[PDB]
CSV table of C-alpha atoms and ligand atoms in Angstrom, one decimal:
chain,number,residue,atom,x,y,z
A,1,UNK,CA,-51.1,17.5,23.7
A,2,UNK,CA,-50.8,17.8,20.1
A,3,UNK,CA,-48.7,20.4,19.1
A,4,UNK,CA,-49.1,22.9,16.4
A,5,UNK,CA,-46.3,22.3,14.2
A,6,UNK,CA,-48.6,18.8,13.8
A,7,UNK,CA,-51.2,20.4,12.3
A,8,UNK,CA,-49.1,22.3,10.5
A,9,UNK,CA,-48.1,18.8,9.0
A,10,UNK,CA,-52.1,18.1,8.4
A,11,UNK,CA,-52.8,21.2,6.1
A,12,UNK,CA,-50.3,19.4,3.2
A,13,UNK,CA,-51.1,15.8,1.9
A,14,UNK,CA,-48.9,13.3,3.1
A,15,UNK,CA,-48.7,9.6,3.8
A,16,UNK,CA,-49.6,8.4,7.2
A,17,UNK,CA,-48.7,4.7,8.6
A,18,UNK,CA,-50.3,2.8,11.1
A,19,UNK,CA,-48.6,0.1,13.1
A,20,UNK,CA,-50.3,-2.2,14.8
A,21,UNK,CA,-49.1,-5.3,17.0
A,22,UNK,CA,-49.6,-9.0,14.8
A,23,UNK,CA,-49.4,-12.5,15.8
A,24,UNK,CA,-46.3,-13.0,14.0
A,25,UNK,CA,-44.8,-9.9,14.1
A,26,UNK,CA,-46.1,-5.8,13.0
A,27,UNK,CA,-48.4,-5.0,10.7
A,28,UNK,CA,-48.5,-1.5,8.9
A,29,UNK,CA,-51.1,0.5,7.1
A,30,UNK,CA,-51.7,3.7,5.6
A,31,UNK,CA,-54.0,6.8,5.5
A,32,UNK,CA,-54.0,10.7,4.0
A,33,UNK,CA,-53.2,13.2,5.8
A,34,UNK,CA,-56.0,15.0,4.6
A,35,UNK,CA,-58.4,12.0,6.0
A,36,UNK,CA,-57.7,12.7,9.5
A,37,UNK,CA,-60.3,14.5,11.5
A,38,UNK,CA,-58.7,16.0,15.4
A,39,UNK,CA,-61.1,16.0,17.7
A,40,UNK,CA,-60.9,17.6,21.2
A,41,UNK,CA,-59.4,15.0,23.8
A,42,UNK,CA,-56.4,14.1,22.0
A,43,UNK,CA,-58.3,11.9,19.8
A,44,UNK,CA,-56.8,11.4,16.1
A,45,UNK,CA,-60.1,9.5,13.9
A,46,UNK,CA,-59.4,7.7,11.0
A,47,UNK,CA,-61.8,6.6,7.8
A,48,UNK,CA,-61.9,2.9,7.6
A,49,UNK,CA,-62.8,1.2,5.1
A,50,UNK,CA,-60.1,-1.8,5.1
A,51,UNK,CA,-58.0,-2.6,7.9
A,52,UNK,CA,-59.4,-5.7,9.0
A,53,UNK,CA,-56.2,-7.1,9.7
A,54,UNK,CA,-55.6,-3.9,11.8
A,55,UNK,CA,-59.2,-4.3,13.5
A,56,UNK,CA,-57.8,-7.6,14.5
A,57,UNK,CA,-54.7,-6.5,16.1
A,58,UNK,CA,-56.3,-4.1,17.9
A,59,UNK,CA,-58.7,-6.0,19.4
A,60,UNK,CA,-55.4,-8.2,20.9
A,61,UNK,CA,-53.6,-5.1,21.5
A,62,UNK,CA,-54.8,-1.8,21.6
A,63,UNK,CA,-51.2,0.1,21.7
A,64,UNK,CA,-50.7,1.6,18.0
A,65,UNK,CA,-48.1,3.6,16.5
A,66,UNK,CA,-48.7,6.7,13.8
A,67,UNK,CA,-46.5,8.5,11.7
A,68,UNK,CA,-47.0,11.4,9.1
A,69,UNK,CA,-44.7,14.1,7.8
A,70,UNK,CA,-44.5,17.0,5.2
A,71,UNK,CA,-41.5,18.7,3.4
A,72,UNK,CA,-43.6,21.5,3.4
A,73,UNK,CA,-43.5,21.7,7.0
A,74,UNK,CA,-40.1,23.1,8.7
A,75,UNK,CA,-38.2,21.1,11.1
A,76,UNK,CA,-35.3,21.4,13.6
A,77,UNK,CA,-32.5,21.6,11.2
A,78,UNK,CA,-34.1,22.7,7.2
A,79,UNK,CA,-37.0,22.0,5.5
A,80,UNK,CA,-39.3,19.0,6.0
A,81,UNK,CA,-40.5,17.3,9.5
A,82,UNK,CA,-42.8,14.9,11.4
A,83,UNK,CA,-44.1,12.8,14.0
A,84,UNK,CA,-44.4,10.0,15.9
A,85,UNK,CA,-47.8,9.3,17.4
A,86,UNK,CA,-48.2,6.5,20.2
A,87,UNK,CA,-51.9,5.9,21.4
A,88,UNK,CA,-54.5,3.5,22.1
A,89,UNK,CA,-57.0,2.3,19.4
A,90,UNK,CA,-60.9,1.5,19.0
A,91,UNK,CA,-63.2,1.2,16.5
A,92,UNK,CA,-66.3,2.9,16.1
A,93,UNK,CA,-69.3,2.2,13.9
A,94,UNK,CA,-71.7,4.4,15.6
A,95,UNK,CA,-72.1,8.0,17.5
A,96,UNK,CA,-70.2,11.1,17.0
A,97,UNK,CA,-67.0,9.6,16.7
A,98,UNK,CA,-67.9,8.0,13.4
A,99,UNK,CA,-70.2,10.7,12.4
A,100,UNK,CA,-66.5,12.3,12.0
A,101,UNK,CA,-65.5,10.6,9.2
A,102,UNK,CA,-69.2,9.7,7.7
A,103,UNK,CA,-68.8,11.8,4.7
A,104,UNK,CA,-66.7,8.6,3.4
A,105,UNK,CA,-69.8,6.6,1.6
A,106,UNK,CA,-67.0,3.7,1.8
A,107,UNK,CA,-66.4,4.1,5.5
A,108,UNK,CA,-67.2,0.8,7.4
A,109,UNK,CA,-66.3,2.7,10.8
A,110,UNK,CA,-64.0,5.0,12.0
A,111,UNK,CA,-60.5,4.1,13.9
A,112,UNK,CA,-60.0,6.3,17.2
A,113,UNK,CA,-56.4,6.9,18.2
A,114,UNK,CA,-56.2,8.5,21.8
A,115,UNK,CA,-52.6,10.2,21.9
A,116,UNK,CA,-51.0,9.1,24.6
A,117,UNK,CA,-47.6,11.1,23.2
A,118,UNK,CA,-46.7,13.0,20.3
A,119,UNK,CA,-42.8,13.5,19.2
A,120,UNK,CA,-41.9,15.6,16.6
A,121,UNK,CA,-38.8,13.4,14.9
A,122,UNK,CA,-37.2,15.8,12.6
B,1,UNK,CA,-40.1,-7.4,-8.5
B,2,UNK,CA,-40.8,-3.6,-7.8
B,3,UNK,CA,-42.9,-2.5,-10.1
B,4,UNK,CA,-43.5,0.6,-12.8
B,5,UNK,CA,-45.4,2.2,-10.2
B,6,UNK,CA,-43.7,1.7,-7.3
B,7,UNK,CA,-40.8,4.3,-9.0
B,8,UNK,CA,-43.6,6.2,-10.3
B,9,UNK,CA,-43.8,7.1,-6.6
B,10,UNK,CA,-40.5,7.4,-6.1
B,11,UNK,CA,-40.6,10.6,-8.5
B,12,UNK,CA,-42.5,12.3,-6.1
B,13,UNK,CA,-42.2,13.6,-2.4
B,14,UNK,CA,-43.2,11.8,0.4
B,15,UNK,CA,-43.2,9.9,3.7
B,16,UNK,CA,-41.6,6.2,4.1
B,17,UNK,CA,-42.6,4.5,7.0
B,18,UNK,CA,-40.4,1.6,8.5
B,19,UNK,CA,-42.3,-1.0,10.9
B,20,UNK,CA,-39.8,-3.6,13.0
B,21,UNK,CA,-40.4,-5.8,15.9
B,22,UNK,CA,-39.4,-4.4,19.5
B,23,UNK,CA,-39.7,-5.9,22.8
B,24,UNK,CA,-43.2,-4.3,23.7
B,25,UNK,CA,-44.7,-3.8,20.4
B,26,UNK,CA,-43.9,-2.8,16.9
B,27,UNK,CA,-41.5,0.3,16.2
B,28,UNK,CA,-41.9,2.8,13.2
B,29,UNK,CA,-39.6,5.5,11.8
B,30,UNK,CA,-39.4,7.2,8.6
B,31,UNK,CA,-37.6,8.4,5.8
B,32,UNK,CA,-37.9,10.6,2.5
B,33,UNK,CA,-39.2,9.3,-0.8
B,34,UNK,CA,-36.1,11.3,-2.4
B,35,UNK,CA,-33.8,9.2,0.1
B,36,UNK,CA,-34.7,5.6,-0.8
B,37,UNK,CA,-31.5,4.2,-3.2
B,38,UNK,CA,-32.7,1.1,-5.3
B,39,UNK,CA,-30.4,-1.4,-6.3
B,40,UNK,CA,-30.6,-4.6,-8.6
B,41,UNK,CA,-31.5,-7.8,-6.7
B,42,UNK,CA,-34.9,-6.2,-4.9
B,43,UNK,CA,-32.9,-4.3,-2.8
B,44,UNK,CA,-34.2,-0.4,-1.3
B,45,UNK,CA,-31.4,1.7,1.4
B,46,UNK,CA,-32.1,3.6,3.3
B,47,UNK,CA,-29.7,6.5,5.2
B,48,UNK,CA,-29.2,5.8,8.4
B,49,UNK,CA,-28.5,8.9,11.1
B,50,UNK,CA,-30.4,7.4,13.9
B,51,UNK,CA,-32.3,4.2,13.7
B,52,UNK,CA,-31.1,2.7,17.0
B,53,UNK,CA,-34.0,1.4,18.5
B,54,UNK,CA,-34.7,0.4,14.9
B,55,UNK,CA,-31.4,-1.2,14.6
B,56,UNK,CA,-31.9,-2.7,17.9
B,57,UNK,CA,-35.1,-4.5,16.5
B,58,UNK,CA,-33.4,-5.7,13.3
B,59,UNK,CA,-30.4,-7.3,15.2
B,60,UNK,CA,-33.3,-9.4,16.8
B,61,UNK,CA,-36.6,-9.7,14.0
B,62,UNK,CA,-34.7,-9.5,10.3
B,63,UNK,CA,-38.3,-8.8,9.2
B,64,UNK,CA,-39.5,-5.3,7.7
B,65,UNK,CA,-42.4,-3.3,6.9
B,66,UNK,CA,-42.5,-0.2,4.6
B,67,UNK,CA,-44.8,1.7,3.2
B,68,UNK,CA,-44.9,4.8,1.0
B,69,UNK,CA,-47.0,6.5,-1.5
B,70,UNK,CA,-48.3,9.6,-3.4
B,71,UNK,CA,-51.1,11.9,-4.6
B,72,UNK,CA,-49.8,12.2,-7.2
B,73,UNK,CA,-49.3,8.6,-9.0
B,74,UNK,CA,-52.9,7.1,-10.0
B,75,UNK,CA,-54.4,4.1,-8.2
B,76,UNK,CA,-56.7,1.7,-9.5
B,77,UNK,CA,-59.9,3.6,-8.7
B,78,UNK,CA,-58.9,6.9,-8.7
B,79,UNK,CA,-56.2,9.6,-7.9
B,80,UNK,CA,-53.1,8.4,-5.3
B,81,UNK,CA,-51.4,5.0,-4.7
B,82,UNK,CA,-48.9,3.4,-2.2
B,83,UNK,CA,-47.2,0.4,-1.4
B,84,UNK,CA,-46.8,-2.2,1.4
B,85,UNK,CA,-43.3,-3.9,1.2
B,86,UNK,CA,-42.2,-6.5,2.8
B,87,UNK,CA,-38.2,-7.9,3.6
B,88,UNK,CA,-35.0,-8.9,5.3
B,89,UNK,CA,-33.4,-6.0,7.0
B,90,UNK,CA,-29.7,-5.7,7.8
B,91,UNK,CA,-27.6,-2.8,8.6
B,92,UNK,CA,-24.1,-2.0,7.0
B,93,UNK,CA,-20.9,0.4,7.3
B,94,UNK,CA,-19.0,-0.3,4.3
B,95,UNK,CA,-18.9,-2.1,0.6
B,96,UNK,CA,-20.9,-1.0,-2.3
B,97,UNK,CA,-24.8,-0.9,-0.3
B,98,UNK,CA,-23.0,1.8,1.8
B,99,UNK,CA,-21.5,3.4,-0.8
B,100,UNK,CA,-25.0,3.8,-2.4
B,101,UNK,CA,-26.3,6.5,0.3
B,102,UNK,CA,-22.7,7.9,1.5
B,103,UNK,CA,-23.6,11.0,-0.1
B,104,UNK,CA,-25.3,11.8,3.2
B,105,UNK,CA,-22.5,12.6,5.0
B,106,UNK,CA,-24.9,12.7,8.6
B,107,UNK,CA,-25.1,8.9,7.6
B,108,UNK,CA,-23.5,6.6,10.1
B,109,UNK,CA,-24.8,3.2,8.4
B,110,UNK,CA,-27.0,2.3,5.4
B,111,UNK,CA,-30.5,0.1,6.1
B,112,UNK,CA,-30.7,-2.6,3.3
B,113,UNK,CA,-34.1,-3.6,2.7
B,114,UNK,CA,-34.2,-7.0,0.7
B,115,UNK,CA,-37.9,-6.7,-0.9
B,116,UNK,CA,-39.9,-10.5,-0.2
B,117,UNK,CA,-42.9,-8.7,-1.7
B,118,UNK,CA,-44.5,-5.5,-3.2
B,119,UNK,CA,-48.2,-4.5,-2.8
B,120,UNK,CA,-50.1,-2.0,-4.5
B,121,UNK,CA,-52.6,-1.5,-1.6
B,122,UNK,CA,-54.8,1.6,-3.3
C,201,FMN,C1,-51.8,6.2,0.7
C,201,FMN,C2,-52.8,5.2,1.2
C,201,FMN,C3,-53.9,5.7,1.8
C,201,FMN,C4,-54.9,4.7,2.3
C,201,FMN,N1,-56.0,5.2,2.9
C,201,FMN,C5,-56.9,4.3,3.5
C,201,FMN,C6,-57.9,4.7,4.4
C,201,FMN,O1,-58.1,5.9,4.6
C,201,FMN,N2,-58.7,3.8,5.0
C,201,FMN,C7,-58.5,2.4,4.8
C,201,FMN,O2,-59.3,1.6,5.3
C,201,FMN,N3,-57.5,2.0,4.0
C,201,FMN,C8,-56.7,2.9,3.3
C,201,FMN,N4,-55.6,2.4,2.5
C,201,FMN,C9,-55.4,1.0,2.5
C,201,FMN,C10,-54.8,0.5,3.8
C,201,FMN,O3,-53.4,1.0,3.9
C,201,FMN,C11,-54.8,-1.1,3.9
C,201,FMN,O4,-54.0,-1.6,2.9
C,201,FMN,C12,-56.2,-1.7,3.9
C,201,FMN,O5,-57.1,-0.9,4.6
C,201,FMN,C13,-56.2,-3.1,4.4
C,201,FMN,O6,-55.9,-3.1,5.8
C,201,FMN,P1,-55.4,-4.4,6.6
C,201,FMN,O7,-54.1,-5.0,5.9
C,201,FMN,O8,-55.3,-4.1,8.0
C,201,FMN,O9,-56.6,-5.5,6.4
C,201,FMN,C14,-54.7,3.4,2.1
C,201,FMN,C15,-53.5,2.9,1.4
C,201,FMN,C16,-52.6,3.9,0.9
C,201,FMN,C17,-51.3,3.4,0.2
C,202,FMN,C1,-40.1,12.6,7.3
C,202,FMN,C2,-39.0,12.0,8.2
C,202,FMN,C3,-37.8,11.6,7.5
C,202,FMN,C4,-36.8,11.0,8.3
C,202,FMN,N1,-35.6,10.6,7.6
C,202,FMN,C5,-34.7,9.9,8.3
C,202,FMN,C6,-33.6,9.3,7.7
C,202,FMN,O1,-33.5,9.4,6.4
C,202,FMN,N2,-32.7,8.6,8.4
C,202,FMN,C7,-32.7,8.5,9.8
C,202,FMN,O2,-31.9,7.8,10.4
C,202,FMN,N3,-33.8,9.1,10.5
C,202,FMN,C8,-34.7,9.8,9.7
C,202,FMN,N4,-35.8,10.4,10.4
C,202,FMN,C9,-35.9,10.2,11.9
C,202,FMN,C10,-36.4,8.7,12.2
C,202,FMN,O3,-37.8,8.5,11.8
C,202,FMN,C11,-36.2,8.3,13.6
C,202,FMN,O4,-37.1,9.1,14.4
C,202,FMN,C12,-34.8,8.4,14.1
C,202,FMN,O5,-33.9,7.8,13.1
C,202,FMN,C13,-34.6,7.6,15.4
C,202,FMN,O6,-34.9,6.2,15.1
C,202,FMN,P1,-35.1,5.1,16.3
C,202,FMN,O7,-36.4,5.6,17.1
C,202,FMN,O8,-35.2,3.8,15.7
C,202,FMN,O9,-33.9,5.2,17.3
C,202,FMN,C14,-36.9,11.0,9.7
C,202,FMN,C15,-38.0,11.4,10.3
C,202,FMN,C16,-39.1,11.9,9.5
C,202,FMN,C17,-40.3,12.4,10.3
């Protein structure tokens, strides 16, 4: 369901953001565009290395919320665009999914995001 | 409170990414780097075209996440930096916080983001 113009996005570095749902409100972390490896099911997979507070949430709640962007990238209306990414998070720490994202020597296991939608916001 | 590096950042392009409360989870939207105005007394607008579910949220949770970073700016262990902040949001229409982003004439409202705290989280 991910559509082209978001990997469009993925071949420039960027900032991405990962919300999460907290015990006292949201919690919000980041990645590089760059880091994320697409794998065929919708599946987004992310390097971890911190995001134990993150872990934490997801293992409460496994909604999640991703957003990424380039300039580069041309929207609706001029240069520049991005997404919103709604899913459902694990983490992995063996198998293929965090053979992904092994080349990392810092990786403590990998966070998989199935995309459940994927809006283009600008 | 912001720090040196924080408008080292600032210098360059990017992503911002906006976390509030909403009723079934956490929301997140974004804006440009180039966008954010920063005023004296911790304070970081935003321009505001849409932002209604994200207004939505504020009316109900004042609390805010942001992040934002860049490639470009070194961390401490290597190449690329960002920034968790956190603060009080409110919305405005008028006075001198509107003023600040009015250039953007798509702009119905400014976000004011009253920083709590700044992390440098690579
Ligand atoms: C631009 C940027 C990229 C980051 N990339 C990663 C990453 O790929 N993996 C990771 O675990 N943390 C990364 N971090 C740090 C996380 O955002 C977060 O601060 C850390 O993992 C702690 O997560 P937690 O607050 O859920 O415990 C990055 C931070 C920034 C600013
Ligand atoms: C890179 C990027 C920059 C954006 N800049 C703004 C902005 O400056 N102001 C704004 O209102 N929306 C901006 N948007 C759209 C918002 O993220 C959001 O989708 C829209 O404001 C609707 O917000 P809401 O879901 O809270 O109703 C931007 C989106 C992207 C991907």
């Amino acid at each position: 369901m991910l559509p082209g113009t978001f990997f469009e996005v993925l071949k420039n570095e960027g900032v991405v953001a990962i919300a999460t749902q907290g015990e006292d409100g949201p919690h919000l972390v980041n990645t590089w565009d760059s880091y994320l490896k697409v794998l065929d099911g919708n599946r987004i997979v992310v390097p971890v290395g911190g995001m134990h507070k993150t872990e934490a949430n997801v293992a409460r709640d496994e909604r999640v919320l991703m957003t990424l962007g380039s300039r580069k990238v041309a929207g609706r209306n001029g240069p520049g665009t991005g997404f919103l990414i709604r899913g459902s998070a694990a983490f992995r720490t063996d198998g293929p999914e965090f053979e992904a994202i092994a080349r990392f020597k810092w990786a403590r296991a990998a966070l998989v995001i199935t995309v459940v939608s994927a809006e283009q916001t600008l």
